[PDB]
Amino acid sequence: VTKSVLFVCLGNICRSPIAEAVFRKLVTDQNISDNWVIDSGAVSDYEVGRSPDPRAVSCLRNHGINTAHKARQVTKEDFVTFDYILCMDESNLRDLNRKSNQVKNCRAKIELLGSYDPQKQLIIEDPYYGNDADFETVYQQCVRCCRAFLEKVR
């Protein structure tokens, strides 16, 4: 079977483009990217059409990873299309669960990415107003989480 996952954050410019790029590298490294549909999206308005924050592009490249993602908002359609919607923080989870209630045929399991961390750092905090170390944090969380997530659902 093909599986599908959409990573979500507030803006789709800092966190979820990282989570998406990390998961895609993972599946590609494992030679199973033909069995996954992967994307990322935003709860909010704030950045649609933008490329990821320079700090996220520079963090990903420190780790050998690029992304061609442009920010987009999560749609009602995303609740039907994706098997998993994995989000960064509790405001994102609140907002997704609320939105999901307007979708008659919601099929997605909506969870926090951090719920899969073996080190139990539940929350992947917005790094925008932080510094480059906070981006690196986010990256390390997404590595840990994504690997556990794939080990569970592969």
Side-chain angles (χ1 to χ4, degrees), residues 91-148:
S91 292
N92 297 153
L93 184 69
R94 288 180 257 109
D95 288 341
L96 290 163
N97 279 329
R98 180 194 307 113
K99 189 172 187 81
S100 78
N101 287 340
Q102 272 66 248
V103 181
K104 288 163 81 160
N105 42 344
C106 184
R107 285 203 314 88
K109 287 215 255 290
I110 300 164
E111 302 177 312
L112 291 163
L113 178 59
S115 71
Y116 286 88
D117 187 5
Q119 299 297 123
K120 289 187 180 325
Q121 191 172 354
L122 181 71
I123 313 299
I124 299 171
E125 287 188 28
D126 186 350
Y128 186 85
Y129 297 96
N131 55 20
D132 284 305
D134 289 322
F135 288 77
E136 179 59 22
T137 296
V138 164
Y139 172 85
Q140 292 297 341
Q141 290 182 92
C142 282
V143 167
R144 298 195 303 269
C145 295
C146 285
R147 171 158 31 252

Side-chain angles (χ1 to χ4, degrees), residues 30-41:
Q30 278 299 300
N31 294 307
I32 53 165
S33 68
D34 298 345
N35 302 318
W36 283 83
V37 175
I38 301 164
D39 194 21
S40 58

Side-chain angles (χ1 to χ4, degrees), residues 72 74-82 85 99 103 105:
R72 69 176 189 74
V74 174
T75 71
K76 305 159 148 330
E77 292 56 58
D78 286 334
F79 299 88
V80 189
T81 46
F82 283 102
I85 293 178
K99 189 172 187 81
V103 181
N105 42 344

